[PDB]
Amino acid sequence: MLPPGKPEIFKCRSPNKETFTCWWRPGTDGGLPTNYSLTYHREGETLMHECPDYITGGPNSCHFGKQYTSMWRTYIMMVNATNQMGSSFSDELYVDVTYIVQPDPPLELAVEVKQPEDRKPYLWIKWSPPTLIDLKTGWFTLLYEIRLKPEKAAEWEIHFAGQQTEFKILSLHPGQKYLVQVRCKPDHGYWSAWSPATFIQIPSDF
């Protein structure tokens, strides 16, 4: 017997500046929606468009493939929540793909102990970028940070690796096991989630 309450587009994110996805939530305190429709227009155009893909982003999401995504151009979007008693519209949300970039975590974090003759020994960390980022053309630029700590230590040691995909750490405590994680951000944008940890035992003879 109630129309939907007022829905909210609460987040958008682009993982690679080539596609993006936005997510909404239904308002509490109205009735159950039976449909949502996300519409938008773009700065400098009058054409109104519907969300091009309601499936890929899962529940209550709009995903914009490559053919609907461009940088440097505001999207003005709105979602409505409808049922047989009526309808409710979100606030318009102003989004620029340029400012919502957050990559997925780096992949294949691997770690090794290296003990060279009379050069300082070291921990060798290596990893790869998330898939579907285009670094090779210079479209996308990725910066990385490593953190590592033994269990029960109160602080992580953080090392900024800039754009390298490998790094060397000196003077770890001999005999201690370390948890190592890597994360990445665009040149301009948000840090990814930390990768899952890799574990490494630093040998006694270090």
Binding site: E43, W72, R73, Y94, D96, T137, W139, H188
Partner: protein, 186 residues
């Protein structure tokens, strides 16, 4: 030495975008968070009228000489508004200090970037017809109007446009560095 030039250029451009981002955020949170200034920002940039690539594929389609010259037009077009932004802000008695310092730094760094760009073009494309055709900014009366709301909104749009354009210049310089130096195997 192309590689040292590109490297310095990309340092300046990525730094200019940083400063512009921070200036806009400090202006926004302090002067305009209290209304639909965002709604007024729509379609209002003086470089709008230029033919700029909007996605990776368009950037790859551009020939390189026209792409470099494009970056140079965009940067030459910002000479004027950055001058006025600094002049106007500096001449207030209660000038927001954090904002003023970034604007002065951007104004100076933008000159240094443009010099680099001019070196890069004469190294990579020595023949280029020297001929300026960049778009004109003519927004000074609005920055000067006594009506505070119209004034703050003209500042909002200028800063919003600068944050956009610096980001775009940085990104296009990064595409070009990778194209010209590394045949797109950065």
């Amino acid at each position: 030495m192309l590689r040292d030039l590109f490297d310095r250029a990309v340092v300046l451009s990525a730094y200019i975008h940083n400063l512009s981002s921070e200036m806009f955020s400090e202006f926004d949170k302090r002067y305009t968070h209290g209304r639909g200034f965002i709604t007024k920002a729509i379609n209002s940039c003086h470089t709008s009228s230029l033919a700029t690539p909007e996605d990776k594929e368009q950037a790859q389609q551009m020939n390189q000489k026209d792409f470099l010259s494009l970056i140079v037009s965009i940067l030459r077009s910002w000479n004027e508004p950055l001058y006025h932004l600094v002049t106007e802000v500096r001449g207030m008695q209660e000038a927001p200090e954090a904002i003023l310092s970034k604007a002065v730094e951007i104004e100076e760094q933008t000159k240094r970037l443009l010099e680099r760009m001019e070196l890069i073009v004469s190294q990579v494309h020595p023949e280029t017809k020297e001929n300026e055709i960049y778009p004109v900014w003519s927004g000074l009366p609005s920055l000067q109007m006594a009506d505070e709301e119209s004034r703050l909104s003209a500042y909002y749009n200028l800063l919003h446009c600068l944050r956009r354009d610096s980001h775009k210049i940085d990104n296009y310089l990064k595409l070009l560095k990778c194209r010209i130096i590394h045949n797109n195997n950065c």
